[PDB]
């Protein structure tokens, strides 16, 4: 669910997307909620940091 103003969240718990309970570090409809960006000098505006 969305978080309230200035509510910092650091948890990296594997998020469950479907009906099956989220077991292990990975699974169907189980996802690591953090993704890395892409930043390189070859990039243009809109994708620069």
């Amino acid at each position: 669910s969305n978080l309230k103003p200035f509510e910092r969240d650091i948890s990296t718990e594997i998020y469950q997307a479907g009906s099956t309970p989220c077991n292990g570090v990975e699974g169907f409809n189980c996802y690591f909620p953090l993704q890395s960006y892409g930043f390189q000098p070859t990039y243009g505006v809109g994708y620069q940091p």
Partner: protein, 49 residues
């Protein structure tokens, strides 16, 4: 001219991959549509990319 239940196709382990970003698939059911194009066919396994 019908009611489309995406939950059954959504929560069945009888599929390989399920990818789309045009809308978050969990809320497909509650969004109402005019026409549905079913593009059903066959390709090679690694050619899905």
């Amino acid at each position: 001219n019908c009611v489309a239940d995406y939950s059954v196709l959504y929560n069945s382990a009888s599929f390989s991959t399920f990818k789309c970003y045009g809308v978050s698939p969990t809320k497909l059911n509650d969004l109402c549509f005019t026409n549905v194009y079913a593009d059903s066919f066959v390709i090679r396994g690694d050619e899905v990319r």
